[PDB]
């Protein structure tokens with residue numbers, strides 16, 4: 001028994017976090033080999049943020065206007081460029097703590113860990129999901145901008161996220177490590193509203209599989225259903241449609257539990273139409289959608 | 302906005318995790334300076350666990366019967382002793398990655414991060430609370446025994462927990478780093494049932510303060526109450542009694558929000574007697590008790 005939202009161990013990323021200052025603005029950067037990555041709005045004043053012309057603003061910056069601090073060591077900047085919405089600062093020292101790594105752009109619904117940092121210093125780690133509307137429900141006060149999200153496979157860190165903005169709703173928007181935003185958001189202080197935040201159906205089903213593996217079976221019901229009939233119900237409840245790809249990703253969990261995916265869909269259906277009547281699943285009074293099928297296999301096999 | 306259960310960055314502890322084998326039993330150990338700490342039941346066979354005589358079982362073990370592996374480096378054991386329920390293995394090398402650290406014994410209700418490990422390898426990090434019945438609702442399959450729980454203050458790791466057992470209920474029991482169990486549990490495969498798992502009232506109140514800080518105010522009601530009158534209600538709902546010490550620990554949150562502790566207690570009361578009628582607080586459909594007052598200050602000031 002025992003199922004926890006778990007984040008990845010953060011040590012490999014802790015060794016890459018640095019502080020980046022340009023003028024009076026400071027935020028977090030990511031130091032890998034001899035490049036530091038950070039949000040380009042590090043070059044903006046609070047007044048620039050309303051309508052930045054990043055090209056024009058960057059023209060007025062030289063290598064020596066970028067202060068990069070790694071602990072107490074200060075790094076010498078020998079070059080700078082803009083890639084989409086990320087600033088790349090070339091430094092004269094390769095990070096000795098650079099882990100094996102790749103830059104990946106994740107899909108909505110996939111999960112990752114964020115190492116929340118302030119002024120280059122790691123403060124906390126938590127697990128979250130890329131919401132279907134490409135927002136992240138983070139924990140970030142002023143100063144965590146530039147914090148990164150990642151997954152770890154064996155000894156390789158896949159960086160998938162860099163926090164750039166807090167929207168007026170308080171939710172977060174960011175980019176991949178090539179500087180391309182997830183979703184329609186931009187690095188400007190302007191009206192930016194996110195679409196409907198739907199529930200990640202394939203993740204909810206994975207979590208129901210984890211509940212069964214852990215002894216929570218009360219919601220296991222006696223009906224089955226069809227993919228079209230289920231999506232009919234899912235659409236009404238602002239759940240993402242389930243595809244056959246999702247059914248196939250759930251394959252290993254159906255095999256471990258002997259519960260067919262459509263049977264699980266019919267129990268989910270009943271839960272969406274009836275509620276939980278005051279009972280809990282895995283200690284939660286709502287359906288949880290920040291576990292992917294792989295996360296469940298990771299923690300339940 | 303934004304409030305997440307956050308764990309501490311784990312890197313300082315990742316550098317201390319090792320694998321400890323005695324005969325055919327392997328588990329996680331903690332390498333600090335030139336001592337490795339691990340559950341003494343590493344010396345037990347599956348059959349020894351029903352009624353171990355640890356003194357007699359340890360007599361039959363020499364330094365060379367303890368295999369300690371740190372990554373691919375194997376450490377030379379030059380001594381061994383038993384301290385309560387923890388085995389201490391003296392090795393000939395001080396861990397170069399030893400962080401500043403202390404051993405502390407925490408109170409029920411306090412929180413800490415667990416770095417779940419398997420065979421010496423970090424696999425995940427999560428935040429939890431010492432339950433008032435001295436259990437931990439962990440995520441630990443066979444092999445995570447010896448995983449440790451910790452808090453970090455600046456650059457100092459306070460180790461407070463070592464996972465030793467899974468009880469028949471699936472919940473976890475462990476020791477502090479001096480080898481003394483939290484609660485009445487013992488390192489033996491026998492009937493062991495935990496007491497009532499009450500809710501940590503002072504933590505629930507801290508979390509309600511975090512909700513107010515984050516804009517969730519619907520539960521803020523118009524009543525007040527008294528400490529005796531509140532504990533009357535808390536006892537009925539298997540909530541821990543609130544003391545004046547708890548009121549004083551909540552002092553900074555009452556000051557930040559302008560909401561008197563007894564006012565918050567009266568809103569909690571109303572929630573315990575009425576439920577939440579289907580609405581949520583900070584995205585949760587139940588009251589959350591794994592945030593201490595300090596955790597909330599950490600993430601909300």
Ligand SMILES: *C[C@H]1C(=O)[C@]23[C@H](O)[C@H]1CC[C@H]2[C@@]12CO[C@]3(O)[C@@H](O)[C@@H]1C(C)(C)CC[C@@H]2O
Nearest residue numbers: 041045046049141142143145164165166167
């Ligand atoms: C790093 C982000 C952040 O903290 C910002 C923005 O969302 C983004 C860059 C600029 C930051 C602000 C504007 O809104 C923020 O949410 C906010 O935290 C910052 C304040 C505190 C308002 C100061 C100005 C700055 O431009």
Ligand SMILES: *C[C@H]1C(=O)[C@]23[C@H](O)[C@H]1CC[C@H]2[C@@]12CO[C@]3(O)[C@@H](O)[C@@H]1C(C)(C)CC[C@@H]2O
Nearest residue numbers: 342346347350442443444446465466467468
């Ligand atoms: C490390 C713990 C663990 O995994 C144990 C016990 O709770 C404790 C030491 C011994 C382990 C067992 C007995 O119960 C466990 O929960 C279980 O995981 C172990 C099995 C798999 C049953 C094998 C025997 C061993 O003694």
